[PDB]
């Protein structure tokens, strides 16, 4: 839950973009007038679960978290997320 937002910006956020956190707000029910201050509310991501959420999450995670990123396409973190590097040995 937690490290799914302090993992999966550590891909989009570097550098304030315009996509996925923002993509999400579409499909979130979010604001242009909010989608403006997220980029800079303690991290859209992080903030998240708290914003999407509204009181700590659970309701919109989970399985809501794919849809709402799966919905609209932003795997490109989640893809990284779940496939960081192959080495060592055995799964």
Excluded: F
């Amino acid at each position: 839950p937690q490290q799914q937002q302090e993992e999966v910006q550590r891909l989009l956020m570097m550098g304030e973009p315009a996509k996925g956190w923002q993509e999400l707000a579409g499909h979130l029910g979010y604001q242009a007038e909010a989608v403006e201050t997220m980029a800079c509310d303690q991290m859209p991501a992080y903030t998240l679960l708290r914003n999407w959420a509204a009181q700590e999450g659970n309701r919109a995670t989970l399985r809501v978290l794919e849809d709402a990123l799966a919905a609209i396409g932003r795997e490109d973190v989640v893809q990284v997320l779940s496939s960081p590097a192959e080495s060592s040995s055995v799964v």
